Amino acid sequence: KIEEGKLVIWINGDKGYNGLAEVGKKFEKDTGIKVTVEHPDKLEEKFPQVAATGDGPDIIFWAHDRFGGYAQSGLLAEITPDKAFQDKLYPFTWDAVRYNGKLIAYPIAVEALSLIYNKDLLPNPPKTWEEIPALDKELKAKGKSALMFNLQEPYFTWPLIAADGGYAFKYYDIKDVGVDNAGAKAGLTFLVDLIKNKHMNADTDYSIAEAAFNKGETAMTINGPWAWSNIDTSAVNYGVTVLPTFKGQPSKPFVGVLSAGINAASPNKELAKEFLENYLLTDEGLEAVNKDKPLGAVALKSYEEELAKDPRIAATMENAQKGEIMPNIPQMSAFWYAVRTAVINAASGRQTVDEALKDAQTGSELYRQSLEIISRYLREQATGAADTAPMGASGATSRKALETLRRVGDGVQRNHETAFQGMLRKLDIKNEDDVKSLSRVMIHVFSDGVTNWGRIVTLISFGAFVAKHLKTINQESCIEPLAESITDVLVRTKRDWLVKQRGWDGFVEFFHV
Ligand SMILES: CCc1sc2ncnc(N[C@H](Cc3ccccc3)C(=O)O)c2c1-c1cccc2[nH]ccc12
Ligand SMILES: OC[C@H]1O[C@H](O[C@H]2[C@H](O)[C@@H](O)[C@@H](O)O[C@@H]2CO)[C@H](O)[C@@H](O)[C@@H]1O
Ligand code: NA
Structure with missing residues (x-):
């Protein structure tokens, strides 16, 4: 679906995209490869949607915070510059674009307000x-x-x-x-x-x-x-x-590091690597972009030495030192979406500050909290023994939602044993490959009908049934990825309903004895 022998690049409309296009023209002049630069609205929302179907641009520019999400979804090519190229950029810029030990993008510039x-x-x-x-x-x-x-x-x-x-x-x-x-x-x-x-x-x-x-x-x-x-x-x-x-x-x-990722679905990975390393991340490449719109403190040592004498960059790095490098973990998207709503609701008076940040905390924690409950439930159901480790200081919700899930979920598995057995036989769960297929079926089931806690218990109860089967056929290692995939279906499709119900506090309340 992505065209070969061409480069399509996405960068945000506030950045130096005309400068980038001049670097595009210089690449085209030397190679005969046309570089198209675009600045779509909401490109950070649109990149994961289209890259997930094998579409989208060859190269995506964003601050590094969104890149761990994209990498976890398998939307990014690992990048493998040699040592001599790695030495041309500051190591803390490489740290920003390192996820699970792999470089998932090219660092371009350090941005602080x-x-x-x-x-x-x-x-x-x-x-x-x-x-x-x-x-x-x-x-x-x-x-x-x-x-x-x-x-x-x-x-x-x-x-x-x-x-x-x-x-x-x-x-x-x-x-x-x-x-x-x-x-x-x-x-x-x-x-x-x-x-x-x-x-x-x-x-x-x-x-x-x-x-x-x-x-x-x-x-x-x-x-x-x-x-x-x-x-x-x-x-x-x-x-x-x-x-x-x-x-x-x-x-x-x-602190954001403007970064350049390569689409995992791109058939032009070698052209993209060649453009980013030998045309953009050079004194003449970064200057062309910088002249259009200032980049900040550039990741390239040679050109950063020239720009550092500018007092505006000095002030940028002073604010950077007093700040924190953003995390690149996949949770960041949900964090930003939650805090955006909280600031807007607090500012307009839709919510008090306490209400707005309460909901933002629930939103930010929703995935990890969901996975902890679902994963503990699936693992204890499969093995017959509970996990002994503590939840931590802030997991009274986790302990109470698991106690609720055990009490309510015992009934659901007993009543649906025959239906679950038939559905498990109709699918062919035998390994990690088959578990990926399950996500489409579960999304498909969760895209039709009413939203309530009973339907959520049924999904998790099916999950526990499958986890028991996995254990029986010596596929215990598949239980955590099953739990990840059930958690994914649940928060993707029901995030706002779950925040509205006060997440797992609502679940405990709804089924309270
Ligand atoms: C992947 C299977 C899954 S996950 C899942 N998660 C929530 N709800 C589901 N179904 C209930 C409807 C229902 C009720 C009783 C028996 C059967 C269906 C609902 O939609 O509210 C299912 C199913 C599912 C869907 C269709 C046939 C099935 N037979 C065994 C499971 C199952
Ligand atoms: O507002 C949340 C938003 O913050 C950051 O986006 C910045 C970006 O880093 C800057 O380069 C500049 O373009 O302004 C954006 C804010 O409007 C995060 O990088 C982004 O993921 C997050 O959604
Ligand atoms: Na924007």
């Missing part, structure tokens, strides 16, 4: 978030505002949520999520109070914030290096500086 301020309106930018309300009152009396930034993407609010101890995953422990802790609460509350006191508007998005800054209407914005081009064109006299502190502690932006 900074405070951007209008020197003509604000010769001394504020050192603290706390002084912004008084600053705004001062600027409002002159027909100006203190601060506008994109409130529709959690990326921009994360530095404030994280300042006082909010975090995604403790360093990575997927069982330790910091989304609804007191630090996160205090940061998002400060944001909601800015909106309440009319210092910020809940509806401000990327476009509105950028135009207000670039027209001289607001003294400050929060943005990455890619934004500096449009500000150059605007004639605003701007500085790039350290983000304001919150409760005496630095803002902690999530």
